[PDB]
Amino acid sequence: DWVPPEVFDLVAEDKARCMSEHGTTQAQIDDVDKGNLVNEPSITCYMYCLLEAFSLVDDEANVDEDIMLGLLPDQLQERAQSVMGKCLPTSGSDNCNKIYNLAKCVQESAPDVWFVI
């Protein structure tokens, strides 16, 4: 994994808040990273929450592609841009479901792109 430990420090406050808001457990987060994702609001709304916290998505879960790419290592950007070509724009019934569908698409196409701590 390329995510360096400093990132865990930076997201700590927003992570704690988002988990509290949505009833998310670390086990659910661990599961996404093992590519087990289910459409459960407690995890899908967590992912929306975290993304919103870092300005990666707006009020209707539209992705800011330049920020999303700006967050990944230079050496994943080419591959990430291809994935975004496939997986964006987002779609779904609400903000949480839009990020569920996005997560599934990215993980099925290139997991290392999908950023969820």
Side-chain angles (χ1 to χ4, degrees):
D1 206 313
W2 55 265
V3 184
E6 294 73 9
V7 175
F8 291 79
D9 281 339
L10 219 90
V11 305
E13 199 182 1
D14 287 295
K15 170 175 179 70
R17 172 175 64 80
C18 292
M19 295 180 82
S20 189
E21 285 182 1
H22 304 291
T24 322
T25 72
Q26 183 64 40
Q28 291 178 287
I29 299 172
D30 286 349
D31 270 349
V32 185
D33 302 288
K34 299 164 207 159
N36 296 137
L37 191 33
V38 299
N39 188 31
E40 279 290 347
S42 52
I43 183 58
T44 66
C45 294
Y46 173 78
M47 294 190 294
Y48 177 81
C49 185
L50 199 62
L51 289 173
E52 190 287 324
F54 283 92
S55 301
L56 294 148
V57 291
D58 67 10
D59 75 322
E60 288 193 338
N62 305 112
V63 169
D64 187 324
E65 296 170 40
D66 290 326
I67 289 168
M68 175 168 280
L69 282 159
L71 259 34
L72 303 166
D74 290 346
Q75 81 185 60
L76 296 184
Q77 292 199 29
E78 187 154 285
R79 191 154 180 181
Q81 221 158 16
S82 174
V83 176
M84 290 158 82
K86 172 177 176 179
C87 297
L88 303 175
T90 62
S91 69
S93 53
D94 62 55
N95 285 348
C96 301
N97 185 67
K98 281 166 178 172
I99 301 313
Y100 173 70
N101 290 143
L102 174 58
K104 297 285 291 202
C105 188
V106 171
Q107 279 192 302
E108 290 163 358
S109 312
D112 271 354
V113 168
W114 189 237
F115 188 55
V116 164
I117 275 189

mmCIF file of all heavy atoms in Angstrom, residues 3 14 22 24 32 35 40 45 77-78 81-82 85-86 95 97 103 117:
data_model
loop_
_atom_site.group_PDB
_atom_site.id
_atom_site.type_symbol
_atom_site.label_atom_id
_atom_site.label_comp_id
_atom_site.label_asym_id
_atom_site.label_seq_id
_atom_site.Cartn_x
_atom_site.Cartn_y
_atom_site.Cartn_z
ATOM 1 N N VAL A 3 -0.349 4.393 0.626
ATOM 2 C CA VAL A 3 -0.826 5.405 1.576
ATOM 3 C C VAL A 3 0.169 5.402 2.744
ATOM 4 O O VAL A 3 0.347 4.372 3.382
ATOM 5 C CB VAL A 3 -2.243 5.150 2.078
ATOM 6 C CG1 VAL A 3 -2.693 6.293 2.979
ATOM 7 C CG2 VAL A 3 -3.236 5.017 0.912
ATOM 8 N N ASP A 14 -11.731 13.880 10.931
ATOM 9 C CA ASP A 14 -12.838 13.633 10.000
ATOM 10 C C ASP A 14 -13.224 12.179 9.967
ATOM 11 O O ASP A 14 -14.404 11.855 9.871
ATOM 12 C CB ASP A 14 -12.503 14.128 8.592
ATOM 13 C CG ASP A 14 -12.526 15.647 8.494
ATOM 14 O OD1 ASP A 14 -13.611 16.222 8.666
ATOM 15 O OD2 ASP A 14 -11.465 16.245 8.269
ATOM 16 N N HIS A 22 -22.268 7.901 11.016
ATOM 17 C CA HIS A 22 -22.889 6.855 10.205
ATOM 18 C C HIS A 22 -22.953 5.478 10.829
ATOM 19 O O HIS A 22 -23.479 4.559 10.212
ATOM 20 C CB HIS A 22 -22.227 6.878 8.824
ATOM 21 C CG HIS A 22 -22.336 8.236 8.198
ATOM 22 N ND1 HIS A 22 -23.552 8.754 7.762
ATOM 23 C CD2 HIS A 22 -21.423 9.223 8.038
ATOM 24 C CE1 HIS A 22 -23.375 10.005 7.365
ATOM 25 N NE2 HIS A 22 -22.098 10.325 7.548
ATOM 26 N N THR A 24 -20.313 3.547 11.471
ATOM 27 C CA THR A 24 -19.329 2.760 10.783
ATOM 28 C C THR A 24 -18.359 2.102 11.738
ATOM 29 O O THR A 24 -17.936 2.715 12.704
ATOM 30 C CB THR A 24 -18.490 3.654 9.862
ATOM 31 O OG1 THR A 24 -19.323 4.660 9.267
ATOM 32 C CG2 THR A 24 -17.730 2.772 8.782
ATOM 33 N N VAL A 32 -13.785 -2.998 2.729
ATOM 34 C CA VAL A 32 -13.702 -2.347 1.417
ATOM 35 C C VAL A 32 -12.315 -2.606 0.821
ATOM 36 O O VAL A 32 -12.166 -2.978 -0.349
ATOM 37 C CB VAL A 32 -13.939 -0.826 1.498
ATOM 38 C CG1 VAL A 32 -13.965 -0.236 0.086
ATOM 39 C CG2 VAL A 32 -15.213 -0.501 2.275
ATOM 40 N N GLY A 35 -11.796 -5.590 -0.730
ATOM 41 C CA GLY A 35 -12.757 -5.678 -1.834
ATOM 42 C C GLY A 35 -14.088 -6.352 -1.509
ATOM 43 O O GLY A 35 -14.728 -6.943 -2.383
ATOM 44 N N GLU A 40 -24.458 -0.803 2.261
ATOM 45 C CA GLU A 40 -24.964 -0.553 3.609
ATOM 46 C C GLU A 40 -24.641 0.887 3.921
ATOM 47 O O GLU A 40 -23.484 1.246 3.881
ATOM 48 C CB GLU A 40 -24.259 -1.454 4.639
ATOM 49 C CG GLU A 40 -24.839 -2.894 4.703
ATOM 50 C CD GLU A 40 -26.229 -2.927 5.300
ATOM 51 O OE1 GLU A 40 -26.677 -1.920 5.900
ATOM 52 O OE2 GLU A 40 -26.871 -3.970 5.172
ATOM 53 N N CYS A 45 -22.149 5.730 3.300
ATOM 54 C CA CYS A 45 -22.240 7.114 3.724
ATOM 55 C C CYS A 45 -20.978 7.584 4.431
ATOM 56 O O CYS A 45 -20.663 8.760 4.403
ATOM 57 C CB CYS A 45 -23.439 7.327 4.650
ATOM 58 S SG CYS A 45 -25.026 7.106 3.862
ATOM 59 N N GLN A 77 -1.214 8.296 -11.541
ATOM 60 C CA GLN A 77 -2.168 9.199 -12.164
ATOM 61 C C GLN A 77 -2.667 8.749 -13.550
ATOM 62 O O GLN A 77 -3.860 8.838 -13.801
ATOM 63 C CB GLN A 77 -1.654 10.635 -12.153
ATOM 64 C CG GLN A 77 -1.591 11.210 -10.712
ATOM 65 C CD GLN A 77 -1.529 12.725 -10.662
ATOM 66 O OE1 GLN A 77 -2.036 13.417 -11.557
ATOM 67 N NE2 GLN A 77 -0.929 13.256 -9.592
ATOM 68 N N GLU A 78 -1.787 8.240 -14.407
ATOM 69 C CA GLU A 78 -2.182 7.740 -15.741
ATOM 70 C C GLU A 78 -3.256 6.653 -15.627
ATOM 71 O O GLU A 78 -4.334 6.716 -16.259
ATOM 72 C CB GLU A 78 -0.949 7.200 -16.493
ATOM 73 C CG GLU A 78 -1.213 6.812 -17.935
ATOM 74 C CD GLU A 78 0.034 6.901 -18.820
ATOM 75 O OE1 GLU A 78 0.454 8.022 -19.172
ATOM 76 O OE2 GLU A 78 0.586 5.840 -19.176
ATOM 77 N N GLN A 81 -6.562 8.119 -14.137
ATOM 78 C CA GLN A 81 -7.288 8.884 -15.137
ATOM 79 C C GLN A 81 -8.095 7.935 -16.046
ATOM 80 O O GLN A 81 -9.241 8.214 -16.365
ATOM 81 C CB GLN A 81 -6.320 9.780 -15.931
ATOM 82 C CG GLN A 81 -6.808 11.195 -16.253
ATOM 83 C CD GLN A 81 -5.652 12.151 -16.546
ATOM 84 O OE1 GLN A 81 -4.530 11.728 -16.804
ATOM 85 N NE2 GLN A 81 -5.926 13.446 -16.502
ATOM 86 N N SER A 82 -7.515 6.797 -16.422
ATOM 87 C CA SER A 82 -8.240 5.785 -17.204
ATOM 88 C C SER A 82 -9.466 5.227 -16.429
ATOM 89 O O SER A 82 -10.581 5.094 -16.975
ATOM 90 C CB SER A 82 -7.290 4.656 -17.591
ATOM 91 O OG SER A 82 -7.965 3.592 -18.239
ATOM 92 N N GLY A 85 -12.180 7.794 -16.344
ATOM 93 C CA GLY A 85 -12.840 7.748 -17.645
ATOM 94 C C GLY A 85 -13.959 6.712 -17.673
ATOM 95 O O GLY A 85 -15.018 6.952 -18.237
ATOM 96 N N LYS A 86 -13.728 5.557 -17.057
ATOM 97 C CA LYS A 86 -14.739 4.515 -17.000
ATOM 98 C C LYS A 86 -15.804 4.791 -15.961
ATOM 99 O O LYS A 86 -17.004 4.556 -16.201
ATOM 100 C CB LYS A 86 -14.112 3.154 -16.699
ATOM 101 C CG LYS A 86 -15.150 2.024 -16.418
ATOM 102 C CD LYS A 86 -14.429 0.683 -16.198
ATOM 103 C CE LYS A 86 -15.376 -0.431 -15.835
ATOM 104 N NZ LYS A 86 -14.602 -1.686 -15.670
ATOM 105 N N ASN A 95 -26.382 10.350 -2.503
ATOM 106 C CA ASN A 95 -24.946 10.555 -2.309
ATOM 107 C C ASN A 95 -24.218 9.287 -1.880
ATOM 108 O O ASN A 95 -23.127 8.980 -2.383
ATOM 109 C CB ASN A 95 -24.704 11.696 -1.298
ATOM 110 C CG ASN A 95 -24.960 13.101 -1.887
ATOM 111 O OD1 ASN A 95 -25.101 13.269 -3.102
ATOM 112 N ND2 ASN A 95 -24.985 14.117 -1.013
ATOM 113 N N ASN A 97 -25.217 6.047 -2.189
ATOM 114 C CA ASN A 97 -25.262 5.052 -3.273
ATOM 115 C C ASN A 97 -24.381 5.429 -4.485
ATOM 116 O O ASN A 97 -23.811 4.553 -5.145
ATOM 117 C CB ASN A 97 -26.705 4.878 -3.701
ATOM 118 C CG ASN A 97 -26.890 3.799 -4.727
ATOM 119 O OD1 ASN A 97 -26.698 2.603 -4.464
ATOM 120 N ND2 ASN A 97 -27.327 4.210 -5.903
ATOM 121 N N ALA A 103 -17.116 3.288 -5.874
ATOM 122 C CA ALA A 103 -16.178 2.391 -5.203
ATOM 123 C C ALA A 103 -16.137 1.022 -5.885
ATOM 124 O O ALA A 103 -15.049 0.448 -6.089
ATOM 125 C CB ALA A 103 -16.572 2.230 -3.710
ATOM 126 N N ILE A 117 -9.760 5.418 3.869
ATOM 127 C CA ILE A 117 -9.100 5.128 5.138
ATOM 128 C C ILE A 117 -10.171 5.116 6.237
ATOM 129 O O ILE A 117 -11.209 5.799 6.154
ATOM 130 C CB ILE A 117 -8.021 6.193 5.474
ATOM 131 C CG1 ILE A 117 -6.691 5.868 4.796
ATOM 132 C CG2 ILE A 117 -7.727 6.252 6.974
ATOM 133 C CD1 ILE A 117 -5.526 6.788 5.291
#
